Structure 1
Amino acid sequence: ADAKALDELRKPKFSSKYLIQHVSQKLIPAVKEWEKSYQP
């Protein structure tokens, strides 16, 4: 409860980092399969 930590309190809070991660978890498997199925 109270008196949390230091390494829990050192993180910047409302940074993105998990929109970038959520895009990177939905862009990378969806573009790894695009390059293995590609003919012009």
Structure 2
Amino acid sequence: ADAKALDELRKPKFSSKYLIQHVSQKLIPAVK
């Protein structure tokens, strides 16, 4: 799927950051 539950995914809900701060340390060499 519906829309009104899917507009709520525009908000940050992660409640942990052991991936979002990890991937930027390894995305840019992998795409370069």
- TM-score by length of structure 1 reads 0.28
Distance 1:5 1:27 in 2: 29
Q: Which residue of 2 aligns with 1:6?
A: 6
Q: Number of aligned pairs?
A: 31
Cα deviations across residues 4-30 of structure 1 (Å, max 9, x unaligned)? 999999999982323101000000233
Report the RMSD for the aligned CA atoms in angstroms.
Answer: 6.8
**Could you tell me the percent identity over the aligned residues?**
100
Segments of structure 2 that go 5 or more residues without pairing to the other structure are none
Distance 1:3 1:27 in 2: 30
- TM-score by length of structure 2 reads 0.31
Segments of structure 1 that go 5 or more residues without pairing to the other structure are 32-40
